[PDB]
Amino acid sequence: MTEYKLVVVGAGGVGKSALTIQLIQNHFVDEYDPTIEDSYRKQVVIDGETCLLDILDTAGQEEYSAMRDEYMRTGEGFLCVFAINNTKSFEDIHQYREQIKRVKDSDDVPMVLVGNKCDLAARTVESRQAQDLARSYGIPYIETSAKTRQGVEDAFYTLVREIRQH
Ligand SMILES: Nc1nc2c(ncn2[C@@H]2O[C@H](COP(=O)(O)OP(=O)(O)NP(=O)(O)O)[C@@H](O)[C@H]2O)c(=O)[nH]1
Ligand SMILES: [Ca+2]
Ligand SMILES: [Ca+2]
Ligand SMILES: [Ca+2]
Ligand SMILES: [Mg+2]
Ligand SMILES: [Mg+2]
After folding, report:
1. Belongs to which family?
2. Using CA atoms, how far apart are residues 117 and 141, in angstroms rounded to an integer?
């Protein structure tokens, strides 16, 4: 089968782990345990193709971010995650994209911009603002909620479909 190595990056607390665990294990992690570097593997059929997904869940907390660049280096596609109720996390996306470019030594790496926590109403990043950022990078924007499952499969499968175009 075909293997896709996906890496999930973004600021601390935006929901990278909750998204990944919802996809892989079908439950919502309510507590906040900061991640160092975790890996998940799942065989899934995506558009009629049996896929092996290797998903790297990375640290967003600066204190835990040692060697994150060495993990990111291995990725074939990246979910760049911010939270729609965390303006700073959205502003931080620029720096994650720059890090991705640096570690892949490429200007056109498969990526999807993900606005997570879309179940929450304290929105400070409007959809149009994120759409514009994604457009500037030439990538899709998708909103998700790790809590309700909204958009979760769509985000990860869209990333696979982006890898397939490159
Ligand atoms: N309402 C809501 N809460 C969410 C959502 N995603 C994550 N959370 C909550 O936000 C907190 C942080 O989630 P977590 O997945 O640990 O974030 P992270 O990006 O992996 N953090 P780190 O970078 O430190 O590893 C948790 O309390 C989690 O339940 C979401 O879509 N909706
Ligand atoms: Ca739970
Ligand atoms: Ca480099
Ligand atoms: Ca593109
Ligand atoms: Mg985490
Ligand atoms: Mg505003």
Report:
1. Belongs to the small GTPase superfamily. Ras family.
2. 14
